[PDB]
């Protein structure tokens, strides 16, 4: 919200969107770039966010700012985009920051799930797959995931 002499955040919606398989294969691993848009399923709805509310572009991944005792990371934007001032209006601004992080993953017996260093649980066996009977390993997710 833009007051006469001040700007105030009415709200800041923060979300983590997965990078689809096709973008990981065709953009990140192939060129080291990410799409500036995030298209993903959230709350049973297909939602699309455009970085800076601008047209889709390929954005280069760059090393993240170094931190001690921290694994390797890459991202595309380090600035949050906020709408330009228009007085006496509520305005919205979208920021999309594509992040790639190498992480440690840990799994305890019977290895039907594992965790990431970020605290995120993955409810699937590390040894899940299609070969050598690994398709009988635990998966909580649908096949298309």
């Amino acid at each position: 919200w833009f007051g006469h002499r001040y700007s105030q955040f009415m709200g800041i919606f923060e979300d983590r969107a997965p990078v689809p398989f096709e973008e990981v294969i065709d953009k990140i691993n192939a060129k080291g770039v990410c799409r500036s848009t995030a298209k993903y399923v959230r709350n049973n709805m297909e939602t699309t966010a455009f970085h800076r509310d601008d047209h889709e572009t390929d954005m280069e991944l760059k090393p993240a700012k170094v931190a001690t005792r921290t694994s390797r990371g890459w991202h595309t934007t380090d600035l949050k985009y906020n709408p330009s001032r228009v007085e006496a209006f509520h305005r919205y601004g979208t920021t999309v920051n594509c992040i790639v992080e190498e992480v440690d993953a840990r799994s305890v017996y019977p290895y039907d799930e594992f965790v990431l260093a970020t605290g995120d649980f993955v409810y699937m066996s590390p040894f899940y797959g299609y070969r050598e009977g690994s398709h009988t390993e635990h998966t909580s997710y649908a096949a298309d995931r």
Partner: nanobody
Amino acid sequence: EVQLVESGGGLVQPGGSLRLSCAASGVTFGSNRMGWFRQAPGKGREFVATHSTYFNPARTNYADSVKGRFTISRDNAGNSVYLQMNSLRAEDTAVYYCLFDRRLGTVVTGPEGYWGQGTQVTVSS
């Protein structure tokens, strides 16, 4: 663990049409690549076509010789791949092999993939 059953080959006169089918059973429930390779007499097994459900819409690839004449598709619900060949020239005489594979790309295969027994296709004037 995948079983592959081919069908639909045989004798063709040049300019004819032939539709090979390959049904896949077993552990086939994820995204995968199903395609056709061929082995000509005294020649290596070379890429012909592939149909990949790793992408939506599915990605089809063809060898240079067969583009525009050969079409690869899949049935609904997947697990069966069809190669419709039109305008079969004399170069098409080979044993065609059906491939089910968890890879991308066109030509590179591996021992982990599953090959069919092979269907003979002869094109003689």
